[PDB]
Protein backbone atom coordinates (compact mmCIF):
# COMPACT_ATOMS: atom_id res chain seq x y z
CA UNK A 1 0.00 0.00 0.00
CA UNK A 2 1.97 3.70 -1.27
CA UNK A 3 1.31 5.68 2.07
CA UNK A 4 3.58 8.63 1.71
CA UNK A 5 3.75 10.76 4.81
CA UNK A 6 1.32 13.78 4.88
CA UNK A 7 2.28 17.03 4.64
CA UNK A 8 -0.96 18.88 4.95
CA UNK A 9 -0.22 20.62 8.06
CA UNK A 10 3.49 21.43 7.62
CA UNK A 11 4.04 24.76 6.59
CA UNK A 12 7.84 26.16 5.03
CA UNK A 13 9.69 28.76 7.51
CA UNK A 14 10.24 32.11 6.03
CA UNK A 15 13.84 31.90 6.31
CA UNK A 16 13.64 29.18 3.17
CA UNK A 17 11.93 31.57 0.82
CA UNK A 18 15.50 32.14 -0.72
CA UNK A 19 16.46 28.81 -0.71
CA UNK A 20 13.21 28.13 -2.85
CA UNK A 21 14.25 30.85 -4.59
CA UNK A 22 18.08 29.85 -5.53
CA UNK A 23 17.15 25.97 -6.19
CA UNK A 24 14.04 27.43 -8.47
CA UNK A 25 16.48 29.23 -10.47
CA UNK A 26 19.08 26.72 -10.37
CA UNK A 27 16.34 24.00 -11.30
CA UNK A 28 15.38 26.32 -14.32
CA UNK A 29 19.30 26.62 -15.48
CA UNK A 30 19.51 22.64 -15.73
CA UNK A 31 16.21 22.92 -17.49
CA UNK A 32 17.74 25.86 -20.03
CA UNK A 33 21.02 23.18 -20.58
CA UNK A 34 19.03 20.40 -20.98
CA UNK A 35 16.65 21.51 -23.58
CA UNK A 36 19.99 23.53 -25.75
CA UNK A 37 22.23 20.43 -25.50
CA UNK A 38 18.83 18.34 -26.96
CA UNK A 39 18.70 21.01 -29.50
CA UNK A 40 15.65 23.25 -28.94
CA UNK A 41 14.28 26.60 -30.28
CA UNK A 42 14.98 29.59 -28.32
CA UNK A 43 12.63 31.62 -26.77
CA UNK A 44 12.53 35.25 -28.43
CA UNK A 45 8.72 35.13 -28.81
CA UNK A 46 5.40 32.67 -28.42
CA UNK A 47 4.99 31.06 -31.18
CA UNK A 48 3.60 27.57 -31.07
CA UNK A 49 4.55 26.10 -35.02
CA UNK A 50 7.74 26.81 -34.35
CA UNK A 51 8.06 24.85 -30.78
CA UNK A 52 9.13 28.28 -28.56
CA UNK A 53 7.00 28.29 -25.93
CA UNK A 54 8.35 28.16 -22.57
CA UNK A 55 10.31 31.37 -23.61
CA UNK A 56 13.55 30.55 -21.88
CA UNK A 57 13.53 33.81 -20.26
CA UNK A 58 15.57 34.88 -16.97
CA UNK A 59 13.92 33.66 -13.96
CA UNK A 60 13.70 37.39 -13.04
CA UNK A 61 12.40 37.56 -15.72
CA UNK A 62 9.53 34.56 -15.63
CA UNK A 63 6.03 35.73 -14.81
CA UNK A 64 4.66 34.26 -11.60
CA UNK A 65 2.98 31.29 -12.94
CA UNK A 66 6.35 29.93 -14.48
CA UNK A 67 8.19 30.45 -11.04
CA UNK A 68 5.44 28.15 -8.94
CA UNK A 69 6.61 25.20 -11.47
CA UNK A 70 9.70 25.03 -10.24
CA UNK A 71 9.05 26.83 -6.50
CA UNK A 72 5.92 24.04 -5.99
CA UNK A 73 8.14 20.56 -6.27
CA UNK A 74 10.64 22.24 -3.93
CA UNK A 75 7.46 23.17 -1.77
CA UNK A 76 6.21 19.19 -1.15
CA UNK A 77 10.09 18.28 -0.81
CA UNK A 78 10.64 20.74 2.11
CA UNK A 79 7.57 19.99 3.56
CA UNK A 80 8.64 16.20 3.29
CA UNK A 81 11.73 16.45 5.19
CA UNK A 82 10.49 19.02 7.75
CA UNK A 83 7.25 16.39 8.99
CA UNK A 84 10.06 13.73 10.01
CA UNK A 85 11.25 16.30 12.24
CA UNK A 86 14.47 16.71 10.83
CA UNK A 87 16.53 20.22 11.96
CA UNK A 88 17.34 22.39 8.73
CA UNK A 89 19.36 26.01 9.57
CA UNK A 90 21.32 28.38 7.95
CA UNK A 91 24.61 28.38 9.62
CA UNK A 92 27.44 30.94 9.71
CA UNK A 93 28.39 30.24 5.87
CA UNK A 94 25.34 30.73 4.95
CA UNK A 95 25.16 33.91 7.16
CA UNK A 96 28.89 35.03 5.02
CA UNK A 97 26.94 34.58 1.38
CA UNK A 98 23.93 36.42 2.79
CA UNK A 99 26.31 39.36 3.85
CA UNK A 100 28.09 38.75 0.32
CA UNK A 101 25.12 39.17 -1.80
CA UNK A 102 18.17 36.71 -23.84
CA UNK A 103 19.37 34.78 -21.40
CA UNK A 104 22.85 32.80 -21.29
CA UNK A 105 22.46 30.32 -18.74
CA UNK A 106 24.97 28.66 -16.02
CA UNK A 107 24.55 26.19 -13.91
CA UNK A 108 26.78 24.38 -11.42
CA UNK A 109 27.63 20.90 -11.91
CA UNK A 110 26.40 19.27 -8.64
CA UNK A 111 28.02 15.74 -9.01
CA UNK A 112 30.93 17.54 -7.64
CA UNK A 113 29.96 17.71 -4.43
CA UNK A 114 30.62 14.30 -1.65
CA UNK A 115 27.75 13.47 0.35
CA UNK A 116 28.36 11.95 3.69
CA UNK A 117 26.79 8.95 5.32
CA UNK A 118 23.47 9.98 7.48
CA UNK A 119 22.89 12.50 4.52
CA UNK A 120 22.98 9.82 1.77
CA UNK A 121 20.66 7.63 4.12
CA UNK A 122 18.14 10.34 4.38
CA UNK A 123 18.67 10.83 0.63
CA UNK A 124 17.69 7.35 -0.22
CA UNK A 125 14.68 7.54 2.56
CA UNK A 126 13.33 10.62 1.23
CA UNK A 127 13.98 8.95 -2.85
CA UNK A 128 12.18 6.35 -1.47
CA UNK A 129 8.91 8.32 -0.01
CA UNK A 130 9.07 9.86 -3.50
CA UNK A 131 8.96 6.97 -5.47
CA UNK A 132 5.63 6.03 -2.86
CA UNK A 133 3.93 9.42 -4.37
CA UNK A 134 5.19 8.08 -7.45
CA UNK A 135 2.91 4.60 -7.12
CA UNK A 136 0.02 6.05 -5.06
CA UNK A 137 -0.44 8.60 -8.36
CA UNK A 138 0.54 5.36 -10.99
CA UNK A 139 -2.40 3.31 -8.78
CA UNK A 140 -4.98 6.21 -8.40
CA UNK A 141 -4.76 6.65 -12.49
CA UNK A 142 -4.97 3.00 -13.39
CA UNK A 143 -7.84 1.65 -11.41
CA UNK A 144 -9.27 5.39 -12.88
CA UNK A 145 -8.66 3.88 -15.83
CA UNK A 146 -9.78 0.11 -15.16
CA UNK A 147 -7.10 -1.73 -16.91
CA UNK A 148 -3.04 -2.41 -16.59
CA UNK A 149 -0.41 -3.00 -14.38
CA UNK A 150 2.61 -1.06 -14.46
CA UNK A 151 5.71 -3.16 -13.87
CA UNK A 152 7.58 0.17 -11.57
CA UNK A 153 4.28 -0.56 -9.19
CA UNK A 154 6.79 -2.75 -6.73
CA UNK A 155 8.30 -2.11 -3.34
CA UNK A 156 11.49 0.42 -3.70
CA UNK A 157 13.55 -2.31 -1.98
CA UNK A 158 12.35 -4.34 -4.89
CA UNK A 159 13.24 -1.64 -7.62
CA UNK A 160 16.50 -1.67 -9.20
CA UNK A 161 19.20 0.99 -9.17
CA UNK A 162 18.59 2.39 -12.42
CA UNK A 163 14.85 2.66 -11.69
CA UNK A 164 15.57 4.04 -8.45
CA UNK A 165 18.05 6.64 -10.24
CA UNK A 166 15.50 9.39 -10.73
CA UNK A 167 14.13 9.86 -6.80
CA UNK A 168 18.21 9.13 -5.78
CA UNK A 169 19.49 11.91 -8.13
CA UNK A 170 16.59 14.41 -6.99
CA UNK A 171 17.20 13.08 -3.21
CA UNK A 172 21.40 14.05 -3.61
CA UNK A 173 20.47 16.86 -5.91
CA UNK A 174 18.59 18.68 -3.32
CA UNK A 175 20.39 17.35 -0.57
CA UNK A 176 24.09 18.67 -2.44
CA UNK B 1 53.42 42.91 -25.16
CA UNK B 2 56.46 41.54 -23.63
CA UNK B 3 60.17 43.21 -23.52
CA UNK B 4 62.69 40.45 -25.18
CA UNK B 5 65.37 43.07 -23.35
CA UNK B 6 63.52 42.48 -20.15
CA UNK B 7 62.85 38.47 -20.43
CA UNK B 8 66.60 37.86 -21.34
CA UNK B 9 67.95 40.33 -18.54
CA UNK B 10 65.11 39.17 -15.83
CA UNK B 11 65.71 36.50 -13.23
CA UNK B 12 61.75 36.18 -12.24
CA UNK B 13 60.14 33.11 -13.18
CA UNK B 14 56.70 32.18 -13.12
CA UNK B 15 53.73 28.96 -13.04
CA UNK B 16 50.62 28.63 -12.40
CA UNK B 17 47.83 26.08 -10.88
CA UNK B 18 44.49 25.74 -11.97
CA UNK B 19 42.19 24.43 -9.11
CA UNK B 20 39.02 22.38 -11.42
CA UNK B 21 35.72 23.57 -10.82
CA UNK B 22 33.98 21.20 -8.52
CA UNK B 23 37.21 21.11 -5.99
CA UNK B 24 36.43 23.29 -3.34
CA UNK B 25 39.87 25.64 -3.38
CA UNK B 26 39.76 26.06 0.77
CA UNK B 27 41.19 22.55 0.57
CA UNK B 28 43.95 23.81 -2.37
CA UNK B 29 47.03 25.14 -1.15
CA UNK B 30 49.70 26.61 -3.90
CA UNK B 31 53.12 27.91 -3.53
CA UNK B 32 56.94 26.78 -2.69
CA UNK B 33 58.54 24.38 -0.43
CA UNK B 34 62.15 23.31 0.19
CA UNK C 1 34.31 36.68 -1.59
CA UNK C 2 32.29 33.63 -2.65
CA UNK C 3 32.34 33.35 -6.85
CA UNK C 4 30.10 31.48 -8.86
CA UNK C 5 32.92 28.74 -9.21
CA UNK C 6 31.77 28.22 -13.25
CA UNK C 7 33.45 30.95 -14.78
CA UNK C 8 36.73 29.56 -15.16
CA UNK C 9 39.25 27.53 -12.80
CA UNK C 10 40.75 29.29 -10.21
CA UNK C 11 44.49 30.36 -11.34
CA UNK C 12 46.72 31.08 -8.68
CA UNK C 13 50.17 32.23 -10.29
CA UNK C 14 52.92 32.00 -8.23
CA UNK C 15 55.88 34.29 -9.41
CA UNK C 16 59.34 34.36 -8.02
CA UNK C 17 62.23 36.73 -8.23
CA UNK C 18 65.22 34.76 -7.62
CA UNK C 19 67.19 38.53 -8.01
CA UNK C 20 66.00 39.23 -4.81
CA UNK C 21 64.03 36.22 -3.21
CA UNK C 22 60.76 37.56 -3.51
CA UNK C 23 57.76 35.19 -3.89
CA UNK C 24 54.40 36.70 -4.74
CA UNK C 25 50.74 35.34 -5.94
CA UNK C 26 48.06 36.38 -8.23
CA UNK C 27 44.79 35.68 -7.90
CA UNK C 28 43.30 36.57 -10.52
CA UNK C 29 45.03 39.18 -12.88
CA UNK C 30 45.34 40.69 -9.08
CA UNK C 31 48.34 40.71 -6.89
CA UNK C 32 47.17 38.71 -3.74
CA UNK C 33 48.22 40.99 -0.19
CA UNK C 34 50.68 37.75 0.92
CA UNK C 35 54.89 37.96 -0.36
CA UNK C 36 57.60 35.83 1.06
CA UNK C 37 60.83 37.03 1.48
CA UNK C 38 63.65 34.18 1.05
CA UNK C 39 67.34 34.03 2.11
CA UNK C 40 69.81 33.75 -0.75
CA UNK C 41 70.38 30.27 -2.37
CA UNK C 42 67.20 28.69 -1.45
CA UNK C 43 66.25 26.18 -3.42
CA UNK C 44 62.17 26.11 -4.02
CA UNK C 45 60.47 23.30 -5.19
CA UNK C 46 56.52 24.17 -6.85
CA UNK C 47 54.45 22.45 -4.68
CA UNK C 48 50.72 22.15 -3.59
CA UNK C 49 48.29 20.74 -1.22
Not at chain 1, 14 to 19: A, I, P, V, W
Not at chain 1, 69 to 87: C, D, F, N, Q, V
Not at chain 2, 3 to 28: C, H, K
Not at chain 3, 5 to 27: K, Q
Request: glycine content about 6%; charged content about 25%; proline content about 5%.
Amino acid sequence: NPQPVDTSNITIPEKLEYFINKYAEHSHDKWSMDKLANGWIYGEIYSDSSKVQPLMKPYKLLSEKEKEIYRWPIKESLKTMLAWGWRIERTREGDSMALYNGYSPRAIDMSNVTLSRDLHAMAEMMAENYHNIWAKKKKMELESKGGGNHPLLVPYDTLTAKEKAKDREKAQDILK
Amino acid sequence: RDDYDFLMQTSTYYYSVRIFPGQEPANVWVGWIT
Amino acid sequence: PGQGRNNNGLEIGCVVDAASGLLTFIANGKELSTYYQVEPSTKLFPAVF
